[PDB]
């Protein structure tokens, strides 16, 4: 079929599975959240907490689905239908290395739900305690062994793909051991080989030799807030793509619809990026496409604390907070606008 509605499997949408309810988790996990002290506010701060009540959740927006559980199979079905609406073929699942049965259950539920809609799943490997290339190898082996035969497990030209958040916190001399074909614990040419996509943060002077010396297959930028880093400044994307092409690397710029995290970081207003009825998202997505990249990542499906979510949000005013909402747009606007941009992306692939 050639309907212009099909999923795109070079479009990766960052997905968070850390939400709970008192009932599916024993607590409205993540809907309740600590408020961060101001790093420039001095000692003795008592910033308090957001209790995750109906009235007061840890977001500047309010989900259409309410204070949902990421383990609720009925929520997961709805989320996969939202991915289908957005045409986002790959769910890039945040992975925290919790090593508990509830994590294992949730990952299985997500894979199963995704497969029903032909969605694929890859892992976004977060920075967990004592993360290093040896335990990262062991965890890559574990993920590929546990999930690699699941029909929803993502592969690109036969290889799994991992996004590695905060990769720059591990020295290239360590990465080389894992990612050079000659590295002492290499995954190259093994059953556990994968496309490893590192987080490009700062200037090319630093990031170019890092990516080469660490033997990453590519890089992404994550941040939805334009100008937060060099990498998340879209005017740099043409140049970053040129360098990627010259060096055989895969650039997967990250685009998002806005940013606001001031419920949890009241002092962080400088990072706010207003949605302007979709114009911010449009501008950022257009820059990614114009850069001529082969793949795009979306920050985020549902990072509600960041205010970067494309998941449907609704107007809500409670006794505790007046939430932002999608304004003149309907709750599903960012899903349907994602589908629009996926179509434009596919037209120039």
Ligand X SMILES: Cc1cc(=O)oc2cc(O[C@H]3O[C@H](CO)[C@@H](O)[C@H](O[C@H]4O[C@H](CO)[C@@H](O)[C@H](O)[C@@H]4O)[C@@H]3O)ccc12
- Count of residues touching ligand X (by CB under 6 A): 13
Which string of x and - marks every residue 104-143 that binds ligand X (by CB under 6 A)?
----------------------x-----------------
Q: Is 161 in the site for ligand X (CB under 6 A)?
A: no
Instruction: Decide: helix, strand or coil at residue 153.
Output: strand
C-alpha to C-alpha distance for 334 and 340, rounded to whole angstroms: 10
Under 8 Å between Cβ of 260 and 272: yes
Q: How far is the CB of 74 from ligand X (least distance, A)?
A: 24
Q: Is 220 in the site for ligand X (CB under 6 A)?
A: no
In the complex with ligand X, the residue whose CB is nearer, 177 or 273, is 273
Burial status of residue 30 (CB atoms within 10 A of its CB: 0-12, 13-18, 19 or more)? buried
C-alpha to C-alpha distance for 101 and 195, rounded to whole angstroms: 27
Cβ atoms < 10 Å from Cβ of 108: 13
Quick one: CA torsion of 123, 129, 133, 136, rounded to 10 degrees? Answer: -30
Q: How far is the CB of 165 from ligand X (least distance, A)?
A: 5
C-alpha to C-alpha distance for 244 and 216, rounded to whole angstroms: 11
Residues whose CB falls within 8 Å of the CB of residue 110, separated by 6 or more in sequence, listed in order: 15, 17, 76, 91, 93, 121
Q: Of the candidates 59, 303, 309, 338, which one interacts with ligand X according to CB under 6 A? A: 303
Cβ atoms < 10 Å from Cβ of 109: 17
C-alpha distances in angstroms, 106 versus 77, 90, 94, 147? 13, 17, 12, 13
Q: Is 306 in the site for ligand X (CB under 6 A)?
A: yes
Q: How far is the CB of 170 from ligand X (least distance, A)?
A: 15
Which string of x and - marks every residue 167-206 that binds ligand X (by CB under 6 A)?
----------------------------------------
Largest CA distance in the chain: 62
Q: How far is the CB of 20 from ligand X (least distance, A)?
A: 13
Site for ligand X in 233-262 (CB under 6 A): 259
Q: Of the candidates 271, 295, 313, 324, which one interacts with ligand X according to CB under 6 A? A: 271
DSSP string, 94-121: EE----SHHHHHHHHHHHHHHHHTT-EE
Under 8 Å between Cβ of 11 and 285: no
Q: How far is the CB of 280 from ligand X (least distance, A)?
A: 13
Which residues lie across from 121 on neighbouring strands?
A: 91, 153
In the complex with ligand X, the residue whose CB is nearer, 121 or 225, is 225
Burial status of residue 99 (CB atoms within 10 A of its CB: 0-12, 13-18, 19 or more)? exposed
Q: Is 165 in the site for ligand X (CB under 6 A)?
A: yes
From 65-73, 78-86, 217-225, 246-254, give the range in contact with ligand X by CB under 6 A.
217-225
Q: How far is the CB of 190 from ligand X (least distance, A)?
A: 27
Q: Is 228 in the site for ligand X (CB under 6 A)?
A: yes
Q: How far is the CB of 220 from ligand X (least distance, A)?
A: 11
Site for ligand X in 18-77 (CB under 6 A): none
Closest residue to ligand X: CB criterion:
223
From 50-58, 97-105, 185-193, 220-228, give the range in contact with ligand X by CB under 6 A.
220-228
In the complex with ligand X, the residue whose CB is nearer, 84 or 285, is 285
Give the interface with ligand X as residue ranges (CB under 6 A): 94, 126, 165, 222-225, 228, 259, 268, 271, 303, 306
């Amino acid at each position: 079929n050639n309907l212009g509605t099909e999923l795109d499997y070079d479009t990766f949408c960052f997905y968070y599975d850390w939400y709970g309810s008192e009932a599916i988790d024993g607590q409205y996990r993540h809907w309740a959240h600590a408020i961060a002290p101001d790093p420039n506010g001095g000692s003795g701060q008592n910033p308090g907490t957001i209790p995750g009540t109906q009235e007061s959740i840890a977001s500047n927006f309010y989900p259409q689905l309410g204070r949902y559980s990421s383990s609720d199979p009925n929520i997961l079905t709805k989320h996969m239908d939202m991915f289908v609406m957005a045409r986002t073929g790959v769910l890039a699942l945040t992975w925290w290395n919790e090593q508990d049965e509830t994590e294992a259950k949730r990952i299985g539920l997500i894979l199963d739900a995704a497969d029903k809609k032909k969605i694929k799943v890859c892992f976004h490997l977060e920075p967990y305690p004592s993360r290093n290339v040896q335990n990262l190898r062991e965890n890559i082996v574990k993920l590929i062994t546990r999930y690699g035969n699941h029909p929803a497990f993502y592969r690109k030209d036969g290889k799994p793909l991992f996004f590695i958040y905060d990769s720059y916190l591990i020295e290239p001399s360590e990465w080389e051991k894992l990612l050079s074909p000659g590295g002492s614990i290499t995954i190259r040419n093994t059953a556990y080989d994968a496309l490893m996509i590192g987080l490009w943060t700062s200037s090319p002077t630093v990031q170019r030799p890092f990516i080469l010396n660490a033997h990453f297959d590519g890089f992404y930028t994550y941040f939805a807030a334009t100008g937060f880093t060099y990498g998340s400044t879209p005017t740099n994307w043409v140049s970053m793509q040129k360098w990627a092409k010259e060096n055989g690397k895969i650039f997967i710029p990250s685009v998002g619809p806005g940013y606001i995290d001031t419920r949890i970081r009241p002092w962080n207003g400088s990072v706010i990026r207003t949605r302007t009825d979709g114009q911010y998202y449009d501008a950022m997505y257009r820059k990614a496409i114009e850069a001529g990249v082969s793949a795009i990542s979306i920050t985020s499906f549902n990072q509600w604390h960041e205010g970067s979510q494309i998941e449907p949000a609704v107007p809500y005013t409670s006794s505790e907070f007046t939430y932002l909402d999608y304004e003149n747009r309907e709750p599903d606007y960012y899903l349907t606008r994602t589908a629009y941009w996926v179509g434009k992306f596919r037209e120039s692939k």
